[PDB]
């Protein structure tokens, strides 16, 4: 029923579990924006969006106009915020698809306004403060003007923390206050003020404002080791899986894979797994591992584009087509791969390729298989 | 008419340039297999495949059944070979879609034969020999010869082909490569003796194609070279002149001197990079700070007057190359190419005009 040899299994109940724990943290009056940029950090933005919709979150965030359109094309009705850059030639598509756009300057708000005027639609925007608009009086007047524009709905105001996962944050926090304050003095309403990312949500309870932006934590992962984990319980939602393609006993003294960078010592059982660097299992890894029936085993030799080799050095019952876990259970994790790489968990999650089908589970049953090729 | 902030421009003319130069290497009767696995090494398998049909190659090679099916769904009619593993669950789809399957055990062949019999269709297979890569395939011994002899008897199987793959054909020393070919020859000779016919015999990859003209046999497998890239720095690059086909591009989004560019690690411009660079207006600039998920910051330290929307080239022009990122990362050009994410639209060019845009999202 899964006909692909390598897939990403996404447990939807884990997303629910994570979100419910997030919600416990917050007062009822604080809105949640689920951050689903970069294909929901590799989990599949459309399917994740559908779930978030069921679960009644308030906003969804994306990084690209297309990511938003993709959502509209799939029946998503929630408000959507493009956190990232909107190029000028995409203003109209945004307005037509009801994508809230982030704006950094008065000038650009004016461009947007003119476009919405011709569509006869008010364009919803959030203003970004860089703590974007510098936090100063000159900007304060700029916004006051922006708000005058006939075809702009200035719904939101936000900033983003550099270091909430490690206070500089609270410096950044000050600047935004300087903003929120001056704008109040002037009666500019701003329905949604938001500043909190995942780390802030966790460590910084004073920073709830009108909404929080929940990203890495929705997926079941921590933004760093530093945050108060004790605070929030998480379950990772993705498992990268494969099957055993082949097995053989290799004689001693035999090179394996390209460049022959691993040489057998002793007669070794070697398994071949149909996952590679083109799947997002990067060649860069110095110490790659897999989980097979509760055991970790080393990946040996260079990682190929579509295949890897594994030394089975334990007694276990295995055959061709047995399941292999690459990350998300036991001791194989995205954090571990990330640490070996010298990068972060977010990146490992994002790397997972186009050809890797997302298989959605719910109530421990497979409910949906998404192919990006077919 | 491009609406995305970051895109991959694929120059079809360059694919043609590469292919023709590859053809010039070869005598008339040697078959060409175009290797388009991993979405044609990030270039877009469907479009590349269409180009290959138009230019008339003999075979297409994929790594997964689904890769084969995608091509069929877009009207590709050339023979397609799945180089690697086909799991049991995909046998029927393979047969129905005329995806030729790599086989390396009699047992799987028997299973394939059964599914095929039930469909009432013959399955096409190529036999893989493990000659020293130690990856997949039959060990090169007599027991395996017998096994193949038996396989050949299966009524619902067409044993079309037999191949191996070199571990080291791109290195300066060819000794292992020749050793691997010797291992293949033993099998080929023994089977010939036993009367197993075998139409398409193949061993050569891009490096073998370049460096080993004595290894043509029936067919050669061209991959990285198709895309205008060398397999290593050690091949005889003077034999084959190549043009890279892909340019990864963005445009300047914001300026303050630091330009912010809306490309990030999520696009496959990896964070791991310690010396990331970009090309703007003919000059190279440093990417500063950490690479973000969706953007990077660039330092403009020269006086050409960049403005918002000027083009930024990540690789494929001038001094910014896939190889240069690869050097930095301790990987290879193949991986950098494969890295480009689903959200990065593939924009196809020909005669310096845009002829097609593919969105993987919309």
Numbering used by the authors:
A (entry chain B): 3 to 133, 139 to 173, 177 to 384
B (entry chain A): 3 to 258, 279 to 384
Reproduce, without paraphrasing, sentences from the article in which this PDB structure was first reported:
The first is the structure of the enzyme in complex with the PLP cofactor (CdAlrPLP). Uniquely, the CdAlrPLP crystal structure is a tetramer, while the other two structures are dimers. The CdAlrPLP structure gives the highest resolution data, but it also has the highest level of disorder and lacks several residues in proximity to the binding cavity and the dimer interface. Key disordered regions in monomer A include all residues from Lys258 to Thr279; in monomer B the disordered residues are Ser133–Gly139 and Glu173–Glu177, while in monomer D residues Gly197–Ile200 are disordered. The CdAlrPLP tetramer is a dimer of two almost identical dimers, with an r.m.s.d. of 0.274 Å for the superpositioning of main-chain atoms of the dimers. Each dimer is structurally similar to the homodimers of CdAlrK271T (r.m.s.d. of 0.288 Å to one dimer and 0.361 Å to the other) and CdAlrcycloserine (r.m.s.d. of 0.397 Å to one dimer and 0.511 Å to the other). Subsequent peptide sequencing revealed that the minor species corresponded to amino acids 1–271 and 272–382 and that the two peptides resulted from a cleavage of unknown nature at position 271.
